[PDB]
């Protein structure tokens, strides 16, 4: 299309002359090996082509061939049960071509061109189509994978392929303006997929953890951010969300973390079972992995490919989760490509437009009515890892102004193994005032007042922690020692949850309502007994708070009979005093 030669090489930087008329953010091919570069900062007749592999062995004067089209994913049937990298190339075909290392510049296609799919059509000839109307249907891993008209593409249908078995290259619809419509379509990643309307959130993203569903909920069309220092437990939390949530598809985006944690996800998932379907669990997850040493300027593309795949599965009526980990590695990738632009940096070396990039990424969520007539959602869980363990960073202070449901993981609750290590003194969730009618219909009737009782009692506990760190555990009254001990058994029997035990990994909220009603009945009858007046040491040695402490290791299956027995013993253990 447009030709040039390499002028200068520096790491992830190829400044290239001879290119006048090239456009910004359009994908070039660098060198004779055909590396995949993207243009930033074109001037004169040059272009600062950054590259998505390692330039190590490139000489100057090698040709640079532009294309004039931006970074296009290929969106169609076949992305499920798949591992991709930051330019959407399937890593399994790269494994089959190369050895066990990933050599630069090998080209493969993001969808199989030789697997035959089952096309069942749902449009008659002479029918009108707009961008977003469904055309046919392909069954895929038990899902009913629709096939969309590409947006901005309009017209009248001339002819349709019959019900059969065809490949993703076969033109399944031929319109009246000569335009064929295939099973897939290319799409630039830096554009939000156009949509009909954004709704308001009234349904929770059920994590399966007790604290992050009771105290800090996330609505289905909402963002969420979970920071913490290294050793807190971000990644095991996000794999638990990928393993036990009520989402149709889960786009797990490894944006600059280790590869061992991704081999773990590829191995321990196909044994497991999707709860909403009956099938396996790797049959619903799309997995975009750009590891630590896989090259640095591909992380921006790897964080956009995941979100446009999640928007594609939003446009089919599904209900998508996205888990993007270590977005400060994406900010550091922007800093490292900024380091050779020699453009003037903001606080701590980051480029100035970082907050605008984070905003225009996190605003691609949110429970829409699509152009096809159905509703969908993308909910984003972003892990923001600060460098010094300090949340005054320019990345974290630009994340926590646009996310709802911000979740600080501390390290002092993580030294003692208290998982998940959600700090309660500084984490917040704003969706508690639009999930009230959903709770009051689908969990219980007194569930917001019971959640507020828990939060008010934990606030009194963390108020009295001043006095217990200053004066001592004694020189305190019996009622406030009751408050401290009940807060401690809340944090040990309702908040703490280990994600490796067979029981107590997935905890649906009937069990969480049960545990909170146990603890609040214990607290109310204990404070009534302690204002009647008994000793506290003959309260705190009952065989019923051991029942509460083991009430989270019992199964979901027989749970309400156990809850009835716990309530009967919780009146019959203060009957005796």
């Amino acid at each position: 299309m447009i030709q040039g030669v390499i002028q200068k090489i520096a790491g992830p930087a190829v400044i290239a002359k001879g290119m006048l008329g090239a456009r910004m953010y359009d994908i070039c091919k660098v060198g004779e090996e055909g590396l995949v570069g993207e243009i930033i900062r074109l001037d004169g007749d040059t272009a600062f082509v950054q590259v998505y592999e390692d330039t190590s062995g490139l000489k100057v004067g090698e040709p640079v061939v532009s294309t004039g089209l931006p970074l296009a994913v290929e969106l169609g049937p076949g992305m499920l049960n798949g591992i991709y990298d930051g330019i959407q190339r399937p890593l399994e075909r790269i494994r089959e071509k190369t050895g066990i290392y990933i050599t630069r510049g090998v080209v493969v296609h993001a969808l199989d061109r030789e697997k035959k799919w089952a096309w069942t059509p749902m449009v008659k000839p002479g029918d009108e189509v707009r961008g977003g109307m469904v055309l046919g249907t392909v069954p895929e891993f038990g899902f009913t994978h629709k096939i969309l008209v590409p947006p901005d593409v309009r017209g009248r249908v001339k002819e349709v392929k019959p019900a059969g078995e065809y490949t993703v290259e076969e033109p399944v619809v031929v319109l009246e303006d000569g335009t064929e419509l295939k099973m897939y379509h290319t799409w630039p990643v830096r554009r939000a997929r156009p949509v009909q309307r954004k709704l308001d959130p009234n349904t929770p993203f059920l994590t399966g953890m007790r604290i992050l569903d009771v105290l800090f909920p996330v609505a289905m069309g909402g963002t969420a951010a979970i920071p913490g220092p290294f050793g807190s437990g971000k990644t095991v939390t996000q794999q638990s969300l990928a393993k036990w949530s009520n989402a149709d598809v889960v786009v797990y985006v490894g944006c600059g973390e280790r590869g061992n944690e991704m081999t773990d996800v590829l191995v321990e998932f196909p044994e497991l079972t999707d709860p909403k379907t009956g099938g396996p669990l790797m049959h619903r997850t799309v997995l975009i992995a750009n590891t630590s040493n896989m090259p640095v300027a591909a992380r921006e593309a790897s964080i956009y490919v995941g979100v446009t795949i999640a928007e594609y599965f939003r446009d089919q009526g599904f209900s998508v989760a996205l888990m993007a980990d270590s977005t400060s590695r994406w900010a550091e990738a922007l800093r490292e490509i900024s380091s050779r632009l020699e453009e003037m940096p903001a606080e701590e070396g980051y480029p100035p437009y970082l907050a605008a990039r984070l905003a225009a990424f996190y605003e691609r969520a949110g429970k829409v009515i699509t152009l096809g007539g159905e509703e969908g959602a993308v909910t984003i869980v972003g892990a923001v890892s600060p460098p010094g363990g300090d949340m005054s960073e320019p990345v974290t202070q630009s994340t926590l102004r646009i996310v709802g449901a911000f979740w600080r993981l501390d390290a002092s609750l993580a030294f003692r193994r208290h998982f998940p290590a959600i700090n309660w003194n500084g984490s917040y969730s704003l969706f508690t005032s639009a999930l009230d009618p959903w709770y009051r219909e689908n969990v219980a009737e007194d569930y917001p007042e019971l959640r507020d009782a828990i939060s008010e009692l934990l606030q009194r506990e963390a108020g009295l922690q001043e006095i217990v760190q200053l004066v001592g555990p004694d020189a305190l009254q019996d009622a406030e020692r009751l408050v401290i001990e009940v807060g401690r058994i809340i944090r040990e029997d309702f908040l703490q949850q280990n994600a490796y035990h067979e029981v107590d990994a997935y905890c649906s909220m009937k069990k969480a309502y049960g545990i909170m009603k146990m603890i609040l009945a214990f607290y109310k009858e204990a404070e009534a007994a302690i204002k009647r007046g008994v000793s506290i040491d003959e309260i705190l040695q009952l065989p019923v708070l051991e029942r509460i402490g083991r009430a989270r290791y019992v199964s979901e299956e027989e749970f309400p009979a156990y809850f009835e027995e716990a309530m009967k013993e919780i009146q019959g253990a203060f009957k005796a005093l």
């Binding site: 004067g61 066990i100 630590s292 040493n293 800093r335 010094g388 760190q469």
Partner: protein
């Protein structure tokens, strides 16, 4: 042939600028020779159509501009590797300093490695016991793992690394296979040690007899401060070769990575480059990542790489960028404590700021014992109770505490004197779990809430 280039425009620090060099490829090795015939290594880190920047791998004393031809060698930087280097010693460039002949290179590999494919990895899964009771019980070292020893400035990190070198073994009878005992092959990558630590490592490896299985890339402290960049890459090249084409079980000891990050801070401050935190450059995460993540096991093959980096935490914290980013790339750390070494405890491993993210893959039922994870979790909770009750003792004084509060205080210092403290003794995993239950028997039931009832019914006392 052998092309040359004269016309060096500018020499300062570690850098020199050749010009009219369009045929120097990026990342290529040059050799520089002055009028006295002495050659010096170097590597290109920028190529233009005008000129080309070169970093110098040795000391820059004696160069000038009327001479000093710069010639090209090895289009991309390569190490010639054979299997015959399992007893040798090498400097930072990769040349033998033992009076022995140079090797016969079977293959020649690129030094910087290629990133390992996440589809073609395997889970690091097989239990290594190391003899050290804290590492065996509470922070498990599993074969195919990266875990650095975060140490202070005077702490005995080198002795703990040498102890894990001299007694780490895998026990297959617990695992269920037998199938052989082929021992480890040590690759010892030393970056700027001061002949004292070097003499300790050499004397230890020669008394145990490991030098017939171990290659040593020694880069001593007086040797120039740029080839510390080259040293871990041309050590993990040999590690990847000997693990993934000849099926050994290579254990790499990456000594004192703070010298590597100092060398990167030097070469990043000589290039006028965007700092990160405390003056270290932007790409330090990527370079520590492409050292560390060249380890693990692969799928359908036999080998294993186990990395123990050693860290000298500058002001003994987890906030400096070197131990911080090291802890971000790696999977778990083992951190040493200044308090326990003042109290006289070896190995002074405090288990609270240390962890191992691959513990759950390689412990438990049929792989260690049925109580391993639960014993670990109860030791963590009870020793945390001891630690934060010592602060209460420091606030109010002891004679306002009751008895159960004092049992934790007895557990903490009995723990520190008997479980942690061991002078060079090889306590295996069964005896260490026996001592763990002998310390858990200082606490009554009803205060052991993370151990199942049949375990606490049959092991207690």
């Amino acid at each position: 042939l052998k092309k040359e280039y004269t016309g060096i425009t500018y020499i300062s620090g570690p850098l020199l600028f050749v010009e009219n060099a369009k045929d120097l490829a990026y990342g290529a090795i040059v050799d520089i020779k002055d009028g006295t015939g002495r050659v010096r290594g170097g590597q290109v880190i920028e190529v233009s159509e005008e000129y080309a920047v070169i970093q110098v791998f040795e000391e820059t004393t004696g160069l000038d501009l009327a001479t000093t031809s710069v010639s090209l060698v090895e289009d991309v930087a390569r190490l010639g590797v054979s299997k015959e280097m399992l007893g040798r010693r090498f400097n930072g460039i990769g040349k033998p300093i033992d009076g022995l002949p140079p090797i016969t290179p079977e293959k020649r590999l690129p030094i910087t490695g290629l990133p390992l494919n996440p589809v073609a990895r395997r889970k690091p899964e097989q239990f290594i016991q190391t003899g050290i009771s804290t590492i065996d019980v509470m922070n498990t070292l599993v074969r195919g793992q990266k875990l650095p020893i975060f140490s202070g400035s005077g702490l005995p990190a080198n002795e703990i690394a040498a102890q894990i070198a001299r007694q780490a073994t895998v026990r297959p009878d617990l695992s269920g296979e037998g199938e052989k005992e082929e021992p480890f092959a040590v690759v010892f990558a030393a970056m700027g040690i001061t002949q004292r630590e070097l003499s300790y490592f050499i004397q230890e490896f020669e008394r145990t007899g490991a030098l017939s299985r171990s290659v040593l890339f020694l880069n001593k402290a007086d040797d120039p401060t740029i080839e510390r960049i080259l040293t871990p890459r041309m050590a993990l090249t040999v590690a990847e070769y000997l693990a993934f084409e000849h099926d050994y079980h290579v254990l790499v000891i990456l000594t004192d990575m703070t010298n590597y990050c100092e060398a990167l801070r030097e070469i990043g401050a000589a290039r006028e480059e965007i700092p990160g935190r405390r003056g270290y450059p932007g790409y330090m995460y990527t370079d520590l990542a492409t050292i560390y993540e060249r380890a693990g096991v692969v799928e359908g093959k036999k080998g294993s790489v186990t990395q123990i980096p050693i860290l000298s935490m500058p002001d003994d914290d987890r906030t400096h960028p070197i131990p911080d980013l090291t802890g971000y790339i790696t999977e778990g750390q083992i951190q040493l404590s200044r308090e326990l070494h003042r109290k006289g405890i070896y190995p002074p491993i405090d288990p609270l700021p240390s962890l191992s993210r691959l513990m759950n893959n390689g412990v438990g039922k049929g792989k260690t014992r049925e109580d391993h994870k639960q014993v670990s979790d109860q030791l963590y909770s009870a020793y945390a109770n001891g630690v934060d009750i010592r602060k209460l003792v420091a606030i109010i004084g002891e004679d306002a505490l009751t008895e159960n509060d004092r049992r934790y205080l007895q557990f903490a210092d009995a723990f520190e004197r008997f479980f942690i403290n061991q002078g060079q003794q090889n306590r295996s995993i069964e005896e260490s779990l026996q001592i763990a239950w002998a310390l858990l028997s200082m606490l009554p039931q009803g205060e052991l809430k993370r151990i199942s009832k049949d375990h606490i019914g049959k092991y207690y006392g």
